[PDB]
Amino acid sequence: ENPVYEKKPKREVKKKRWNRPKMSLAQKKDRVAQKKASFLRAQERAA
RNA sequence: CUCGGGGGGGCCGGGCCACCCCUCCCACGGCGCGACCGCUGGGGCGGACUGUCCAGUGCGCCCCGGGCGGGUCGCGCCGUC
What we know:
Residues 5-47 are annotated as: Disordered. The chain has one helix at 25-46. The chain is an all-alpha fold and 47 residues long.
């Protein structure tokens, strides 16, 4: 009788982000620097 | 002027270049200033994350400021047989 499809009406939604974005080169570079400082810092404490 | 023959100066008008002042535009090059794009320390807020010391790194919006680069445009000045 009526096979047509009435598309569900789109609604504007609050812009929300549900997953992390890629870490930047600077952040990835700093993290290595922080990790290296932490490793030696621990080694000095042990001694 | 020289022996009718021979050698010369010419005839008055216009505009142009050299002389002296300014003066319009264009092109090229240089110096100085401004507007817009436009390469890239701070401050405020929001957030996401990182580090086996509380410290640190991006991202978003906005407000600055520096180094000082170029591109477009607008000027002022200087140079050009």
